[PDB]
Design a protein around this motif. Structure first.
Motif, short mmCIF file in Angstrom:
data_model
loop_
_atom_site.label_atom_id
_atom_site.label_comp_id
_atom_site.label_asym_id
_atom_site.label_seq_id
_atom_site.Cartn_x
_atom_site.Cartn_y
_atom_site.Cartn_z
N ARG A 265 -5.41 31.62 24.89
CA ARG A 265 -4.39 31.78 23.99
C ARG A 265 -3.82 30.67 23.38
N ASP B 157 5.04 25.20 25.08
CA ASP B 157 5.22 26.27 25.99
C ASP B 157 4.66 27.59 25.59
N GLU B 158 3.46 28.11 25.95
CA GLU B 158 2.80 29.32 25.57
C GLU B 158 3.21 30.50 26.14
N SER B 159 4.11 30.05 27.28
CA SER B 159 4.78 31.39 28.08
C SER B 159 6.15 32.06 27.54
#
Length: 125
Positions: free
Chosen positions: A43, A117-119
């Motif tokens: 992702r 921050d992909e989360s």
């Protein structure tokens, strides 16, 4: 030169000023161009718009401290999330695209954004 690398690296993996498709094909080409296919990254989010306003998240003009060491943006950004399809770790790396506009969370170093921050998940529209 004086290490500007992390910042330039962040822009290479997460920034595209004026995109035209923001679809599956867009992700396939962009993941390949930005070298995130060996191995296929699961992702990756591309931020669009004004580069100055992204850098501004590291200061009080467009950012606020978040979870102690991160910064959350005051304004929303147009973004395209590319999510890998299939269970293989090898190319062709196919992706599904998701267009959205939301506030983003980044990590800064010396006033420059160096980590996305992909989360982080947002209060939806």
């Amino acid at each position: 030169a004086q290490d500007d690398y992390r910042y330039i690296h962040f822009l290479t993996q997460h920034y595209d000023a004026k995109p035209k498709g923001r679809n599956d094909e867009y992700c396939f080409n962009m993941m390949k161009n930005r070298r995130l296919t060996r191995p296929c990254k699961d992702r990756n989010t591309f931020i669009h718009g004004n580069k100055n306003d992204i850098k501004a998240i590291c200061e009080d003009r467009n950012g606020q401290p978040y979870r102690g060491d991160l910064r959350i943006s005051k304004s929303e950004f147009q973004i395209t999330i590319c999510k890998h399809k299939g269970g293989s770790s090898r190319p062709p790396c196919r992706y599904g695209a998701t267009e959205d506009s939301r506030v983003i969370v980044v990590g800064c170093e010396n006033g420059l954004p160096v980590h996305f921050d992909e989360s982080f998940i947002t209060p939806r529209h």
